[PDB]
Amino acid sequence: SKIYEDNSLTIGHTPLVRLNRIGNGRILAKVESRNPSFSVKCRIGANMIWDAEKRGVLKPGVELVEPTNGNTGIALAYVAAARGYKLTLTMPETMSIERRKLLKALGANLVLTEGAKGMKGAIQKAEEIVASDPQKYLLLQQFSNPANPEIHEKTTGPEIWEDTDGQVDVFISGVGTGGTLTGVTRYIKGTKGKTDLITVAVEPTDSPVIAQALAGEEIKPGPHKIQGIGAGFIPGNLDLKLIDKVVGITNEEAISTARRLMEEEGILAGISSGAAVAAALKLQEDESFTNKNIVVILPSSGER
Amino acid sequence: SKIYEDNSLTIGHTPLVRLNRIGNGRILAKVESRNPSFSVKCRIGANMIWDAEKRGVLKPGVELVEPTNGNTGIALAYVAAARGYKLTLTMPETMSIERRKLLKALGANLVLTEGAKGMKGAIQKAEEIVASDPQKYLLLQQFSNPANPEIHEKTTGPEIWEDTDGQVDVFISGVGTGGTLTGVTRYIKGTKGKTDLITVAVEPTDSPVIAQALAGEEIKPGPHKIQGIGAGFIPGNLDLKLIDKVVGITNEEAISTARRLMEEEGILAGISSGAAVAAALKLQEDESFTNKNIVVILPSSG
Numbered sequence A: 001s002k003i004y005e006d007n008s009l010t011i012g013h014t015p016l017v018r019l020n021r022i023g024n025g026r027i028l029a030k031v032e033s034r035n036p037s038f039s040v041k042c043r044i045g046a047n048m049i050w051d052a053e054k055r056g057v058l059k060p061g062v063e064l065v066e067p068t069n070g071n072t073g074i075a076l077a078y079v080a081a082a083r084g085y086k087l088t089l090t091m092p093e094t095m096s097i098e099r100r101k102l103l104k105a106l107g108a109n110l111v112l113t114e115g116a117k118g119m120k121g122a123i124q125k126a127e128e129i130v131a132s133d134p135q136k137y138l139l140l141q142q143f144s145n146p147a148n149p150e151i152h153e154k155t156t157g158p159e160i161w162e163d164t165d166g167q168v169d170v171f172i173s174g175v176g177t178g179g180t181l182t183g184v185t186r187y188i189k190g191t192k193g194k195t196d197l198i199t200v201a202v203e204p205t206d207s208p209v210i211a212q213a214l215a216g217e218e219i220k221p222g223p224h225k226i227q228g229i230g231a232g233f234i235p236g237n238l239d240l241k242l243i244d245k246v247v248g249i250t251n252e253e254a255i256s257t258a259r260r261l262m263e264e265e266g267i268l269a270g271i272s273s274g275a276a277v278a279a280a281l282k283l284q285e286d287e288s289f290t291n292k293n294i295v296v297i298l299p300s301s302g303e304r
Numbered sequence B: 001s002k003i004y005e006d007n008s009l010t011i012g013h014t015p016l017v018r019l020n021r022i023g024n025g026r027i028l029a030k031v032e033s034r035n036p037s038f039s040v041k042c043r044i045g046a047n048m049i050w051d052a053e054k055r056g057v058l059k060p061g062v063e064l065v066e067p068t069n070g071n072t073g074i075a076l077a078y079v080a081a082a083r084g085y086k087l088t089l090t091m092p093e094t095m096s097i098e099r100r101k102l103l104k105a106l107g108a109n110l111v112l113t114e115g116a117k118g119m120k121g122a123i124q125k126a127e128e129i130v131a132s133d134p135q136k137y138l139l140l141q142q143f144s145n146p147a148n149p150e151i152h153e154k155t156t157g158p159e160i161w162e163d164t165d166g167q168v169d170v171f172i173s174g175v176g177t178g179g180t181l182t183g184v185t186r187y188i189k190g191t192k193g194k195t196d197l198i199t200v201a202v203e204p205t206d207s208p209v210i211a212q213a214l215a216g217e218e219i220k221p222g223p224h225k226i227q228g229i230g231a232g233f234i235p236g237n238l239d240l241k242l243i244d245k246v247v248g249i250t251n252e253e254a255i256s257t258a259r260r261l262m263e264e265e266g267i268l269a270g271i272s273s274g275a276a277v278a279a280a281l282k283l284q285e286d287e288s289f290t291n292k293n294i295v296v297i298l299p300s301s302g
């Protein structure tokens, strides 16, 4: 039989689709919106919780607190609802109403922080909360929790490897927490020994901290429009050593490519998905990439 | 390998999830929002197109024409863009503006039809555009094209049978085109021979045309809020003979049950999904249903 005991167990097994009009026919797009909550974040929402349960830190009585409210917050709310945990989400008061209605519909307890302070406030306001009662509260922290890249090493990676029968030559991932890039690469280059896999990190041209970091330059972030990626720093879950190339994408290239994905391929993609595919197109302008099969993660449906 | 040649080929194989708080533990919800375009309609959008291609009527340069007021047009738009077809959608002026904006944004050529005539006028107009140039245009009519229930007989049904190892006892489907109910039932009662499967059609209490039709009464529809179901007439794709029971659901029951799905199960469900599950709850109020495995279609997300 194949009956899932709860919605959190339905994560992954997302489809790999050949793009026929965008690129040379060798761009294979992994559609992470085919997940509960419509984004790749459901994999880590699920595993960070399962991991906490296995470690014995999450159990009856313990409750969750997260500064998140973007794709990870939604992912944590659905898993919390499905598995019976109280969840408190802190978020700058700037968030859309439908966004909070959705989180509340999922049963999350919302705590709004000073709009001007932005996410930096919610992050502070959450550590304040957990610090207030360290035993009662659990802060997961997607940027450094190993269970983040671990789920990609155990599911996303194997899926890419099996779906291409090992025929994956390049792997492109827009970096947010870095967990997808890190986990998939560890599985393919490490576990499967395909050391000639080319791992490409994608980031906004206006906040190129990975390229800065790799070049030994000072980290200087900037504002950009590619929601989901470009956090402005190097996350603990991003292993810079696994990166073979970094491609910077402009807000305009990301948006226009996301539109091409719907119009030319019938794939409803978010802006970061457009950015990742734009990176694939850039690489294909280089003759060394011409006959390589490129697997690209499309993180979410967008928001639209 | 498992590389899909285009997004239309990725339909189906949706998860069956046990509901743990809602109901007695025997309600298994099939999540149709895990499909491209986020609804069960991608199955028919894809198969009507694949079928037309197989029949030889759909060919490059041929433009699709389909009447719609909801999810089918949206799914057809995804599928059309994926396989390279231009698409025209006829829809009544009763349709909301946001809905019109969304459909155009997805690439469809929109033809609004007389508000007074409803869906009947939209299908009427679709046929006329086709007849205006039959070599250029191909009609894809979801209420009568048998490729609709056919895809459910070939994918949804088998998925339900394999996922429950044949242990499904009741099948609940809120009816719009009726294709899901018809195809799944044909597969399970017919191909698999499980004649005692109890097939349940769900409809809005305020527009109980299936109950009316089965009672031999005059069909008198009414306004309701369960989007996606209750077309107000008996679709050619609804085989009334396959229905064992009809459960009427109120707007309030549908909405509150959809909310329970989100909060108690972490399942993002649309109103018609709440309606289908509310019907399951109603059946479990009856001792004869207490130990049965109930499979319920959750057509789309919230």
Ligand SMILES: *Cc1c(COP(=O)(O)O)cnc(C)c1O
Pocket: A039, A040, A041, A071, A072, A174, A175, A176, A177, A178, A179, A180, A181, A227, A228, A229, A270, A272, A273, A299, A300
């Ligand atoms: C999280 C996310 C990413 C980046 O994924 P990471 O595994 O965190 O690198 C990209 N786009 C969107 C929309 C995301 O939510």
Ligand SMILES: *Cc1c(COP(=O)(O)O)cnc(C)c1O
Pocket: B039, B040, B041, B070, B071, B072, B174, B175, B176, B177, B178, B179, B180, B181, B227, B228, B229, B270, B272, B273, B299, B300
């Ligand atoms: C199409 C649809 C249904 C009904 O499915 P049928 O197979 O057409 O009867 C129910 N709910 C929603 C939201 C739908 O889009």
Ligand SMILES: [Cl-]
Pocket: A031, A033, A266, A267, A268, A269, B007, B036, B037
């Ligand atoms: Cl899609």
Ligand SMILES: [Cl-]
Pocket: A007, A036, A037, B031, B033, B266, B267, B268, B269
């Ligand atoms: Cl869901």
